[PDB]
Scaffold this motif. Structure first.
Motif, PDB file in Angstrom:
ATOM      1  N   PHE B  53       0.825  -1.209   0.000  1.00 26.17           N
ATOM      2  CA  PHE B  53       0.000   0.000   0.000  1.00 26.17           C
ATOM      3  C   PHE B  53       0.857   1.257   0.000  1.00 26.17           C
ATOM      4  CE2 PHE B  53      -2.276   3.532   1.841  1.00 26.17           C
ATOM      5  CZ  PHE B  53      -3.518   3.461   1.214  1.00 26.17           C
ATOM      6  N   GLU B  56       3.007   1.787  -3.071  1.00 24.78           N
ATOM      7  CA  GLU B  56       2.262   2.408  -4.185  1.00 24.78           C
ATOM      8  C   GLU B  56       2.068   3.914  -4.055  1.00 24.78           C
ATOM      9  OE1 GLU B  56      -1.255   0.032  -6.457  1.00 24.78           O
ATOM     10  OE2 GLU B  56      -0.405   1.952  -7.172  1.00 24.78           O
ATOM     11  N   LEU B  57       2.050   4.409  -2.823  1.00 30.40           N
ATOM     12  CA  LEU B  57       2.013   5.850  -2.593  1.00 30.40           C
ATOM     13  C   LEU B  57       3.434   6.397  -2.386  1.00 30.40           C
ATOM     14  CD1 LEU B  57      -1.134   5.931  -0.267  1.00 30.40           C
ATOM     15  CD2 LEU B  57      -1.078   6.517  -2.690  1.00 30.40           C
ATOM     16  N   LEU B  81      -4.735   8.789   0.206  1.00 27.94           N
ATOM     17  CA  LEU B  81      -5.510   8.529  -1.005  1.00 27.94           C
ATOM     18  C   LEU B  81      -6.345   9.745  -1.421  1.00 27.94           C
ATOM     19  CD1 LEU B  81      -6.670   4.857  -0.361  1.00 27.94           C
ATOM     20  CD2 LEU B  81      -5.080   5.598  -2.149  1.00 27.94           C
ATOM     21  N   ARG B  84      -4.118  12.385  -2.887  1.00 33.57           N
ATOM     22  CA  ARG B  84      -3.649  11.910  -4.183  1.00 33.57           C
ATOM     23  C   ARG B  84      -4.763  11.933  -5.232  1.00 33.57           C
ATOM     24  NH1 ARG B  84      -1.464  10.054  -8.307  1.00 33.57           N
ATOM     25  NH2 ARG B  84       0.666   9.240  -8.419  1.00 33.57           N
TER      26      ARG B  84
END
Lengths: 100, 100
Positions: B53, B56-57, B81, B84
């Motif tokens: 997780f 991915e960020l 999220l 983003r």
DNA sequence: CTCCTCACGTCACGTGAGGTG
DNA sequence: CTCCTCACGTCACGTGAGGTG
């Protein structure tokens, strides 16, 4: 025409990035000074935005070169962002169920 | 308990990734077989999701280690999220004006 | 102070090299 | 066929090393 410092400041990239992309042949200044300091044009700035766009969506620099050297990029740029927005939205959706 | 192949298949990461994270001390199998083949647990699977997780960020693996070793991560995971999603939405917004 | 070119370091792995049940 | 450990390669740079107007 702009120096590496200027462009570093405009694009928000390190000078080293601007050196690397030159060495790679991804982004090459229009000319250099009598001393040898690089000179980026507006064309080069436009170009850098595109590079940095595709970079942010994870394209390797060989592919970014290819993409950029094959007028409506905007179509695909929209599709990529939409894909990606939807992906995160699904991730974030998964978070909200976890919070329940 | 799961093999490297299994977990590679479940998480959608290469076996090499699973070796690297072990060597780094980011993700270390609960035990290994009489032969020496790794054995990942459900705890380890849960953990891998979190790793993947934050990865991915864009979190570097040293920071990912730190984050994960300091119960409501979900709060910050939602905020990231949302940040983003909003960022891309702004990018995509910029695309739509270009298309006009 | 920013500009330079070498040139070695780094992070997150990839990719064979050769050997096991 | 997947499992292994070395071990060198790679991509996108970072980071001094020493020299210029």
């Amino acid at each position: 025409s702009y120096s590496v410092g200027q462009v570093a400041g405009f694009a928000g990239v390190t000078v080293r990035t601007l050196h690397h992309y030159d060495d790679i042949g991804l982004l090459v200044p229009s000319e250099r000074s009598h001393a040898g300091h690089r000179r980026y044009s507006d064309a080069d700035l436009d170009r850098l935005q595109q590079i940095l766009f595709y970079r942010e969506l994870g394209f390797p620099l060989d592919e970014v070169a290819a993409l950029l050297d094959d007028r409506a990029h905007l179509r695909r740029q929209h599709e990529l962002l939409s894909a990606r927005i939807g992906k995160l939205q699904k991730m974030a959706a998964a978070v909200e169920q976890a919070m329940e």
